[PDB]
Ligand binder design. Structure first.
Ligand code: POV
Ligand code: POV
Ligand code: CLR
Ligand code: CLR
Ligand code: CLR
Ligand code: 2J9
Ligand code: 2J9
Ligand code: 2J9
Ligand code: 2J9
Ligand code: AH2
Lengths: 446, 446, 446, 446
């Protein structure tokens, strides 16, 4: 006998698919998928003929309170029109009574879907983060302002106007140090904690030094302390890693398909978490609470949703929307299972198969083929802890900018000297080149 | 099967909210909340029906006035126009004289509502917090210490006495570089880490400077390590922590409703703290007494104010917003209780009901239901803040303080020696113009 | 009529007490307490005669499953031997059926008892905490070791042995700087980040400088970083402040009296916390699970227990064992209530009293008298955040120790000079005193 | 009322623990745990009695050997000496061929057990972590940068050329203090903040040193801020994170039980990673295969090892101790299931039972019961550690590294110039003894 063992199916992608091609019939070759390749191996060992038949109305099905009158693949079966049923069916309490299931061939579970953490893009000039945008300006104003005072005070101070009485003292000349540019030098050097050569000696100049030196120490120790906070706090941040983490978070908000066995567990929950979580479900039962998985994928993209879903469909989209990720552990336990009529001469024959193919490893091999594919951009790390270029970075651009300006002035130094010198001395450029290569004089002489 | 049971009630959150849907009237589904959930478990354990009724005056109820009549739900409960009154009725003397309440289903006290600390203006100082004021003075005292001691040691020491003679040998002249003033300079300059000349010599000084330098480092490192911690972990404190703390203060105003529960108490109260506050409250009985609880909330948010109501409404307002909190504990004690006409057995019938329903745990479960909301805990590590004008401004102030002090001493210096010129020099204002125009030479020579 | 309204009582301290004195009868004056002073006021307003009578067997009482046959003050009442019952009785489900209670006169609750946080005793030398006890020794070994090398290297280095060619060069003498003591000076100064005067010039001496300067920077920046951790983490520590905090803590362990209405709530709990908490109760049901309150006080003293108790007895012992404290909020709700027989002509007369005395405030006034007393050592703060002497402290002792040693050497300097000088020069002490007061020479001359 | 029901069972935690009390035997109270709690809810929903039975061989059961007989509970379940077998029996092919299991009450996989990271030997370095290796090389490169550039700028600049003439005016000799070697010194010395002479001059140099000093501060402050964070927040990582990661390694040995569930799989497995490991495991089939799971645990604790068992026993061992953890996920998939003789209806009768009992939620509740223990989470902020020899030792190593490098260059210097003596001086070893004994003068003069 054949009977075709009238086998019900349901389009879900990956489990079964229309063949992706041209030409006609493909009769029982039309459908190609996991369940197809499973069915194949069921056929090899027990032996039978398979005529695929999509169910009508396309339903997993359930006992609808109106009349019961199961609405789907359960229905083609219970009336014994159907035979074996090889599709996502999700063993349950209520379905088991009326129709007896095989033993599982897959272990799914409820878990959360969320977008991957994008990155930081610190803004390579992150070093200039820990204080305001405004304070750095005023610190710059102060070094000019204070330095302007050192010039005025020191110059006007009779206790400055010391003498450059050398190592050989007892001559008589005065020669201040605190000219203008050297005044800024005291400011910039103190501000960077390396002490310049020039120093106050008269009290007035010493007071201003003593206070700038205070003005420095607080800014720097505060710069150090902020940056330790920004870095420590960042290090101290964990992403969400559980329903409990999401439970305490009235930020990134929940999501779920309408009843779809997902609300079902939550309504009938007794977990304090999943009881609390349900509160928000009911709360925004117009917004989040979507009515399809395809939207729930689309929705997490646009925004900060966390769609609850069976783990199998997580795995597929994760590996095909690498923007996105699984999170958490398997919340619940369930498992798909090939359907059989009320107690029949196949359930105990179809079950030994599933155990047989298991030991040989064909299922997990089959698990890879359909769900796995092109190697995702998995390459990604969070070793960010140790700082790198993207963290600090900019200071090297600041370094480069510095060295460049020194060149341009150093050229400017050359021109100004020889020109002003040549004004009272020889013509113009005779000086320039003889002065150029006498800087070169292969020794420190002249 | 008798009279259903006429339940009188008033609309007031989170007890009696007008049910939210368009889906027109349904009687026993025109209302929900806690007051309705209590009736459910009440009518479940017992057996009866509601239908429901409402007020026709708004008022909870009170001994009316000179008429000595009764308004509110106490009206309705006297002349048998109704029966049970699950509603926020507060058990009091005058009420119990004319009706008979049930036993409490919930406790209640008078407490405080204040704008939560936000620590968004610590002060234009608070670079100075990270060490105790006790320390900041002791260290300045120690700078005066070692400067005074370095002066003693160095001088009495023979080896400190170099002889300059840099350029040359002989010329047995002697010098002592450390003066008293020069000794501060080492002390102050070392403490701010910029370092100075007057590098010691002659071992007796070198122990001193070494231990000082060790004294410098620990203080700065300790200052730095703490400003890190205060800016990592914000233990944001609160101004007051009680009625007593609130009582002694006058910057903050008390607040209370008007002609009501809270107001009545403090008038009739006879405790010190609570008599003192009726005075302040009586003093301006036009601007610390709002005429509605909603506006009472407002005064806290916009102005500085600390409203006094019942503990339960606070807990509601507390959760919904995020900036309002329960400063202190429970001053008074009261209890809501289900109304009942005089003599009616429905008192004792409910009396066992509420006792029973608690031992189960439902009132607490019901409590968690309708009072909890968003749950707003944020506490998101205090996403670290760019240090700015507020958190440090005084370092700019001590700066401009010292700069002005430098000008005044500098003009001071100018006059002092210009008159010590006059000792050997000519009269007085000669030396003035001489040295004033000594600055007007405008070069690096005399 | 009188009847004495036979009033039952139970020795508990504070509620009722034997009078503390000599001479006999004191007939109904014997007992003195809260309930006594309450009863007093009940008598003033309703009017009656009171004959105290301690119950026999001394029991709150309960329906013992053996025979029911209530075992206590409930028993003297239900048989109508007794009358009013003014004592701690704790309104409940089961007691209410058989005997009808008045309305509460006290609002107790379950809460936790724990010892106060003692302190820190940081060990005043806490500055020397952040690194090991061992590393500081080796850093000290290194400054001697490295300095020993600078002497050897520099002295043996022909590029050192420069000339003290002064400001007037072109003479011919050599005069190293890096003698021994100045070598240590380079070490100690570099280690404290202030740069000494002496500097390497020859490469060999420059390499060792460059590496010590690295050896410094890591130690100090690590000293800073550890100390920021020890301080931050301490700041980041909260004490326990809830049953949930204690729930997550398999450290400081639970405690409770045997059944005593405390286990009762926990067994019949449905809170995930109080269900989890019960797990450990049952677990160590021989150790913690004490059989009396007096032990439970004694036990928390000895060790790290957290005895669960009704709030009233918390309040008393807290204010009389100031070592100890209340913690958490009221977990449960209950409330004492004067007992009355099955429905009787007093419950509705005794209840208006309790409400009457409330409004006048006599209860809370009475609440103070017995529970309050001698002002506890309440003076206590946790403003520890800003560091003070106890935190750092020691460095000032280190400072003092430094200055002292400098004196002793500075004396040693004086003796060594004049003696060695006087050896080739005048006698012994003629030099000493003429040298003493010529250091004084009121100017820097000689 | 029929046969009670003979339940065969094996003692194995946390399922079947011999009940703990002295209180001698009670049949149905000789045993408790999960296996017994399941029977409870099983016999409750159903109706029957246990009495109970045990094994008489110890073994769970297996196809015996050459005899082809059956031991264990599979013996007892064949020849109707018993009935249901609530016990940790694992559903497999050979078992299901001769009996008929129920449907799973729990899932199960093969996974890994490894000694939890303790981060108690980060390394004798890890003062070098807080910035990326990418950075530590770039900054040294920049020191070579600015030293080389300062050399260029300074020299070509006219104004850098001071003329010493300190003691005196004229003598128009010129100097250039910045050599190439002296330019490193500024660079290196500035970077370690000790500061140096060669303080620049002549503006073109001053921009360079300023930007360098700004480059110094950010790096040190960033280093300091991070070593704070790494020592505040210990994100202690793990060596491996999978079988693949474990597979490529050989420092760590795999581990597995022996002649059993786990071992059988990897032999019969045909996946790359799992074929590679049978090789290593086969290679030494005498020291990576313990002969008991208890000793298997041990090898992880004492030695370095990574044991392979079933996921459930791991979760048990995981909670009880605190140092053992579940590295990775679930390799295989299995499921425990209640035994039943062939054809018996008690399979399908229980089948609805387990489905029902889950939808309630009890199996999860039962799961939380007997697997959770102490719950050991400690994570007590990582009570901060006195930095020591481990966390920093390399700073002492780079020190002793450089000191040895200084001696070798120093002797290098000695020879080099001693032979540049010989140019003008006499032969070779003359200058040796001259300068060797030049050190033996033993004073500060030639
Ligand atoms: C980034 C790559 C460039 C690297 C720089 C290139 C190398 C720079 C040089 C390196 C050698 C070592 C440092 C300088 C000399 C040593 C000082 C001394 O002891 O005496 C010297 C005094 O001379 C000086 O002090 C200055 C020397 C430079 C003079 C003129 C510039 C030409 C150098 C090129 C600049 C190009 C600029 C590039 C333009 C694009 C005299 O030396 P001597 O009489 O010969 O014998 C003793 C010298 N001994 C120490 C070897 C024993
Ligand atoms: C802790 C409490 C002790 C405080 C110290 C006590 C006060 C110390 C003094 C303070 C005055 C200010 C500083 C020193 C003098 C100023 C320098 C100068 O310009 O010329 C002076 C050079 O003299 C010196 O440089 C050294 C002076 C001390 C010489 C001998 C020690 C006696 C001082 C006592 C030590 C006791 C040690 C204690 C023993 C237990 C010459 O001064 P003049 O020729 O007179 O006129 C110019 C001076 N004018 C600047 C005022 C205009
Ligand atoms: C010191 C001399 C050279 C002037 C330099 C400019 C500095 C000192 C000026 C410019 C901007 C100023 C600040 C502008 C605004 C505020 C906010 C105010 O609520 C307190 C003062 C404070 C914080 C000012 C303090 C002084 C300040 C920082
Ligand atoms: C540098 C010269 C002067 C010697 C000074 C002594 C210093 C450098 C010595 C004394 C103690 C030594 C340490 C003793 C123990 C250990 C632990 C070992 O697992 C690595 C080496 C290490 C960390 C040593 C490194 C060098 C050390 C720090
Ligand atoms: C690899 C080792 C052995 C050799 C490296 C060369 C070093 C050690 C030596 C060789 C000759 C030396 C130079 C020769 C003379 C002088 C002049 C002096 O006023 C300053 C130092 C200076 C400029 C020396 C600097 C260091 C120097 C460059
Ligand atoms: O004797 S009771 O009416 N029974 C329980 N209730 C409450 C539900 C809060 C309370 C709360 C406080 C009381 F003082 C008494 C009672
Ligand atoms: O309205 S009551 O029955 N009588 C007054 N009190 C008392 C503070 C004793 C309380 C305290 C709490 C209540 F819930 C009820 C009452
Ligand atoms: O269809 S089931 O027998 N019913 C539920 N169970 C579990 C209790 C874990 C599981 C767990 C994993 C499955 F694959 C199937 C089932
Ligand atoms: O012994 S089974 O009924 N058949 C084999 N399978 C798997 C498909 C993996 C599983 C997976 C998990 C189970 F709990 C049971 C089974
Ligand atoms: O048995 C405990 C283990 O830990 C200590 C170490 O010395 C090992 O040799 C030892 O075996």
């Amino acid at each position: 006998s054949n009977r075709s063992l009238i086998v019900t199916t349901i389009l879900e992608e990956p489990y079964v698919l229309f063949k992706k091609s041209d030409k006609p019939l493909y009769g029982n070759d039309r459908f190609e998928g996991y369940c197809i390749d499973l069915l194949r191996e069921l056929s090899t060992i027990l032996g039978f003929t398979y005529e695929i038949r999509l169910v009508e109305d396309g339903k997993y099905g359930a006992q609808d309170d109106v009349n019961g009158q199961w609405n789907g693949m359960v229905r083609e079966l219970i009336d014994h029109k159907a035979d074996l049923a090889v599709a996502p069916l999700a063993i349950t309490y209520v379905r088991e009574k009326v129709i007896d299931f095989s033993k599982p061939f897959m272990t799914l579970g409820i878990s959360i879907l969320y977008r991957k953490p994008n990155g930081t893009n610190p803004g390579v000039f992150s070093f200039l983060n820990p204080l305001s945008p405004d304070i750095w300006m005023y610190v710059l104003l102060a070094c000019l302002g204070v330095s302007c005072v050192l010039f005025v005070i020191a110059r006007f101070s009779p206790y400055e106007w010391y003498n450059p009485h050398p190592c050989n003292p007892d001559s008589d000349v005065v020669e201040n140090n605190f000219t203008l540019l050297n005044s800024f030098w005291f400011g910039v050097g103190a501000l960077m904690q390396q002490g310049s050569e020039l120093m106050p000696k008269a009290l007035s100049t010493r007071i201003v030094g003593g206070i700038w030196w205070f003005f420095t120490l607080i800014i720097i120790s505060s710069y150090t302390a902020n940056l330790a906070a920004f870095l420590t706090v960042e290090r101290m941040e964990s992403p969400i890693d559980s329903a409990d983490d999401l439970a305490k978070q009235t930020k990134i908000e929940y999501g779920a398909v309408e009843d779809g066995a997902t609300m079902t567990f939550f309504k009938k929950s007794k977990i304090s978490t999943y009881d609390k979580m349900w509160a928000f479900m009911s709360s925004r039962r117009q917004s989040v609470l979507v009515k399809s998985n395809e939207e729930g994928i689309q929705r997490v993209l646009t925004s900060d949703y966390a769609f609850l879903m069976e783990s199998t469909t997580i795995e597929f989209v994760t590996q095909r929307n690498c923007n996105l990720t699984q999170i958490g552990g398997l919340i619940d336990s369930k498992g798909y299972g090939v359907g059989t009529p009320m107690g029949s001469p196949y359930r105990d024959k179809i079950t030994i198969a599933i155990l047989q193919l298991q030991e040989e490893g064909k299922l997990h091999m089959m698990k890879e083929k359909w769900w796995r594919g092109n190697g995702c951009p998995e390459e990604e790390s969070k070793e960010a802890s140790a700082l790198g270029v993207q963290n600090i970075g900019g200071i090297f651009i600041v370094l480069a900018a510095g060295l460049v300006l020194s060149v341009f002035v150093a050229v400017g130094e050359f021109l100004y000297k020889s020109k002003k010198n040549a004004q009272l001395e020889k013509r113009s450029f005779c000086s320039a080149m003889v002065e150029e290569l006498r800087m070169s004089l292969k020794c420190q002489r002249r």
